[model samples]
Target: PALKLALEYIVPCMNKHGICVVDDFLGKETGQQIGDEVRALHDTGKFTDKITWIEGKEPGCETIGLLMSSMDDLIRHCNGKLGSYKINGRTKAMVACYPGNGTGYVRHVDNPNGDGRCVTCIYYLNKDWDAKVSGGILRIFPEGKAQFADIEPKFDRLLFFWSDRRNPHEVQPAYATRYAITVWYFD
Candidate 1:
């Protein structure tokens, strides 16, 4: 019921603004557990430093992906409110972590042709993330505009937006370690 209400405002906002930032989208305890779970994988020789995007290996990724897919209720609620885009099972959930000292992705779009992903969801896993220390911020660009939305890596904060050509976003370099889980939805 709470998520449905949040989608009521989020759907329209995405339709107009092409982006929506939701705070405390996931429960506090759940968020902390997932964050710690991913962080533990990093020390267990499961995390890869592939520059730009640090990818996490298996053993726990599949569980996280399935966990992300379980948000069918939230997706259905958003679909009903938006009256479009029937987002089904997710294609992938990349447990990504970024190191401090200038490491981020360039401006890019998730869905370039509208034939692949329908929605892109990112969940921040950085506990007590400070914008001043950790500079890995998600930069969302507006269509045909210069100004963009700067989103901090707040713990448990989930940001989902339409995976269309209109939304070109990027991640700014950080000073401290940053972590996140990115899940993509298909039509």
Candidate 2:
């Protein structure tokens, strides 16, 4: 419900404003359950088997959500939030499964075409994750900074931020395998 509301109110304020928080929306239990499921699937080794290993990093579970109901729900909710900006739309969830601890995606702008990608939603699913132990925290920047501020993977924590052709973001490697579901809203 909160996500649906945020989608309605916050989508328009994206790149023009940088980022917006859902502000303590999901509870710990919900996060724990999500983390558990992510870990289970990751443990299956199917994710590794299904992926194509890349240079400098392990194979990543690519471009998922062809039949994910959760991702579909998010997309449907986004439809209402879109207002009148629906032209060419692309909405889905992707899984990035890293072996051992290694950086996932190299920093790059997500816009494949000249068209704008308004929002990026990152949901971390890590059970009992410690930054001191595990190293897969997202580094967020605001305009100017020599170093990146790390966002921890907690249960049910959702980070919705704006994306552009200029922002450079990277996923630091973790000592253990981790799962993150990302939803991109584009038009």
Candidate 3:
């Protein structure tokens, strides 16, 4: 499939770079569609009341981890790409929201359950994002180089990486609504 072919090239890039970020993973149309859906859900209700809705609380607020709507094809695409690397098991999807000017999640891994998470995929949904408002940059230390992946936050780009706790990464607070569908593959 197209996703597999792309992953063939991308996995090596990530292995060499520690992180691989590709914009337009879902294409422009779908990316924006999904983004709008997530935003609507977020507006329907806050993830948490006092801890997230009101004043200062956690630095970052995500709707629900591993939750996705109308994403079967995306999930299958991810699975196929991962299978090429000998990764197997069920995957979970979640949409994350990093509010404007709000501090995003600091460097951390998606530590899975006993099964353990093998790969983490982040599909960015920030359209026409500017790097100058570069607070939300994702830094990956692949080969000792602090290679920065500037997320245009544009719809369609997908960031895929092997999940290693030591592969420290951080997303600077977004200047606007930073949207994404994050997935975890467990083995």
Candidate 4:
């Protein structure tokens, strides 16, 4: 029921707004664990290129281990939903951290190179994010619209959007350490 209800809101939102977001998707406790693990590794410079693979590995981390173990079920269930005709497979989930160094990512589409990325799924782990003070907001450009949508990277928030040209997005520079886990589903 939880998964179905989630897609119920997610599908229509994606169709109408080109994106969907749900708060507390992983719950605060779970999100904190995941966030803490990422932060700990990052503290040791484990994030090569600002990213670390977390697809099938989470030693001594029950929260993330549960997520990784259940990833197949989650991906399979998400298929054919959220405006996705069919999600055949997905890229490994990666924990991404952006150090608050006045740096941000340039605007770009997820599948601009057409590597078969059909849907972009991201889960944020920044607890109590202050949009005013910590500016790591994700600005999405919805085509045919005048302005953009500034989706705050809130903790335990799960976001879904098509990975085509329709959803060009960018990340604003973070004033503090920010973290998110991302995976791309392909058809």
- Which structure among the candidates has the greatest TM-score? 4
Tens digits of per-residue lDDT for model 4, 1-187: 4467445676667778878887777677777887887777787767772788765555634566665544445556654765756767878778888887867788998888878787788888888888898898999998889999999999888888889999999998888888888888788
Candidate 3 or 2, higher TM-score: 3
Clashes of each: 0, 3, 11, 0
Best model number under lDDT: 4
Model 1: per-residue Cα lDDT over 87-140, one tens digit each: 656655677777676888888887886576877878887878778766888888
All candidates in order of TM-score, best leading: 4, 1, 3, 2
| Candidate 4 steric clashes | 0
| Residue pairs in candidate 2 whose N, alpha carbon or C atoms collide under 3 angstroms | 31-156, 101-174, 102-173
- Give candidate 2 misplaced runs (Cα > 4 Å): 1-17, 48-90, 142-149
Alpha-carbon RMSD of each model: 3.4, 6.5, 6.8, 2.0
lDDT of 1: 0.71
Candidate 2 yields a Cα-based lDDT of 0.55
TM-score of model number 3: 0.70
Relative to the true structure, candidate 1 reaches a TM of 0.83
Clashing pairs in 1: none
TM-score of 4: 0.89
Flag regions of model 4 displaced more than 4 Å.
58-62, 68-75
The models' CA-based lDDT, in order, is 0.71, 0.55, 0.56, 0.77
